[PDB]
Amino acid sequence: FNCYFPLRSYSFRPTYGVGHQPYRVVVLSFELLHAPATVCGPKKSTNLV
Amino acid sequence: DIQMTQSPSSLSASVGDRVTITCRASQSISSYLNWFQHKPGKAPKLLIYGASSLQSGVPSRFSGSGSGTDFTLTISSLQPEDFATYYCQQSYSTPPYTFGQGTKLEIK
Amino acid sequence: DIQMTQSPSSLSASVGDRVTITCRASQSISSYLNWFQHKPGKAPKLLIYGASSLQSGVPSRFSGSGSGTDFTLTISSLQPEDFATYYCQQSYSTPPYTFGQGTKLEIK
Amino acid sequence: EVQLVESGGGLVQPGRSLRLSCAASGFTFDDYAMHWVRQAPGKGLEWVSGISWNSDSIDYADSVKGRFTISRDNAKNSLYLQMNSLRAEDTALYYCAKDRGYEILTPASFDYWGQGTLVTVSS
Amino acid sequence: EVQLVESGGGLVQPGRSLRLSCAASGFTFDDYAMHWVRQAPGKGLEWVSGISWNSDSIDYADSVKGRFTISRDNAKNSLYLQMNSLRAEDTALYYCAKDRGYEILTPASFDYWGQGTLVTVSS
């Protein structure tokens, strides 16, 4: 008492609640700067005119 | 109707262990179960109302979880006054407030 | 405890027929059943994992269906290379990975 | 901190009737539902009966239908349980618990309990 | 495309002990769970034991509790299973399967399998 440890263990089971079920979450953060972009799309390239 | 089963009956641990108890239902009750602590020498007291809602005034050591047909209670600290009999009760099915069998807890 | 049965045991068909197999469970397992094919001359292999998820690398002829209590597997093409035994396994209940009886499949 | 004092316990012969009273003092009583529950000397807890905040919705256990009657007096903050046609299997310990809500058949469960009173039905 | 090679089979008398080895090379072994399962000569396949990616969670079949022991060496990418106190019904085929997950008790089932090795328990 007066001093709890923030760390706690999940109790995931195969048949918990639907919301209780664990979900994997990945957040992708994109930053665009004047520097040459190195992460481009699948669009091909042509010849300049 | 409904049938509640207690997989463990008597459990042994120490003052510095963590214990878990499970209660299984015949069919889904939609997380409507309650956990009661009954000291052999005084009036029984409620520990958990609802699936995972902690009653006021009791230590946060106890933790309830589970939904659907199975439910679980866990003690992380095992303070030396945690000797009692623990019951799981459903309040969703047509049989009103049917209780499961007892679950003895001993420390060793 | 869990008890599960194979309603069909031996089936006869042709090269251009459609066949179905059903797996029956004593209790609902939240569609956590898997289908295995065991060739008599080599090790068995998995085809359908989960309710209706097809494992990559196998032909799309095999189709899983059914959720909850009873489940079904279906073959629409019946290739001449489909001589093997089909099993249904639960991975839900406290008996760890129970496996069902064999289901012989042949064509004549 | 609420109080639940129960009386009327004792020993009677089979086929007789006895009377139980349960008085509460630690909370407002006009808006709470109450229940009577049973604990066998060698078995777990079992529900017996229940009454709402006012005597409109009333419930009894299936095994005790037509034999036991529950009453409630709000003015003196108490409830009562009349036991009629007692048998040898009603020698258990009876608790007088209070419901969290106001109705009888609700997902809400018993919040506070009181020390049980021991009854015996034998010669 | 992964490889699962097994050894240790043969003919033994009841009551003695032996060992079986299973090696995998077609994938990363340090983070996958393995299992040993049994095909009866005239009956369907039954599970025996399983180990996780790390030797922290262990389990055994009910009929073989306290009889068999499993081990796992991630350095050489292999696992081992020890037959102890064998009797008449342990003359079946044994497979070495790979779990799709990493724990021992998960809804994820076996993904790849390997050729079984035959054992005989008789005189």
Answer whether C34's CB lies under 8 Å from E109's CB.
yes
The CATH number given to whatever domain includes residue E97 is 2.60.40.10
Residue E14's domain comprises 4-121
Technique employed here was: cryo-EM
Closest CA to C96 of D9, E28, E107, A34: E107
d(CA E91, CA E18): 13
d(CA E96, CA E82): 13
The CATH number given to whatever domain includes residue C26 is 2.60.40.10
Task: Determine whether the interchain pair D45/B87 forms a contact, defined as Cβ–Cβ distance below 8 Å.
Answer: yes
List CB contacts (< 8 A) between D35 and chain B.
97
Tell me the count of A-C CB pairs closer than 8 A: 6
CB contact B50 to A (< 8 Å): no
Residue B93's domain comprises 4-107
List CB contacts (< 8 A) between A15 and chain C.
30, 92
CB contact B68 to A (< 8 Å): yes
**B91 token code pair:** 């309040």
List CB contacts (< 8 A) between B90 and chain D.
none
To the nearest whole Å, the CA of A35 is away from the closest chain B CA by: 50
Q: What is the CA radius of gyration of chain E?
A: 14
A1, A4, A11 ranked by CB distance to B72: nearest:
A11
Resolution of this entry, Å: 3.7
First CA to last CA across chain E, in angstroms? Answer: 39
CB contact C91 to A (< 8 Å): yes
Find the angle CA(E54)-CA(E55)-CA(E58) to the nearest 5 degrees.
Answer: 120
What is the DSSP pairing of strand B85-90 with strand E10-12? unpaired
Answer whether E12's CB lies under 8 Å from E20's CB.
no
A1, A11, A17 ranked by CB distance to B31: nearest:
A17
List CB contacts (< 8 A) between B55 and chain D.
111
Number of domains in chain D: 1
Q: Which long-range contacts (CB under 8 A, 24 or more apart) does C44-51 make?
A: C44/C84, C44/C85, C44/C87, C44/E45, C44/E95, C44/E113, C45/E112, C45/E113, C46/E109, C46/E110, C46/E111, C46/E113, C47/C73, C48/C73, C49/E100, C49/E108, C49/E109, C49/E111, C50/E107
Task: Determine whether the interchain pair C34/E109 forms a contact, defined as Cβ–Cβ distance below 8 Å.
Answer: yes
CA B82 to chain CA centroid, Å, is 12
CB contact C30 to A (< 8 Å): yes
Alpha-carbon separation of residue D3 from D33, D55, D117 (angstroms):
15, 22, 14
Task: Determine whether the interchain pair B68/A4 forms a contact, defined as Cβ–Cβ distance below 8 Å.
Answer: no
d(CA B25, CA B33): 10
Answer whether B86's CB lies under 8 Å from B101's CB.
no
Number of domains in chain C: 1
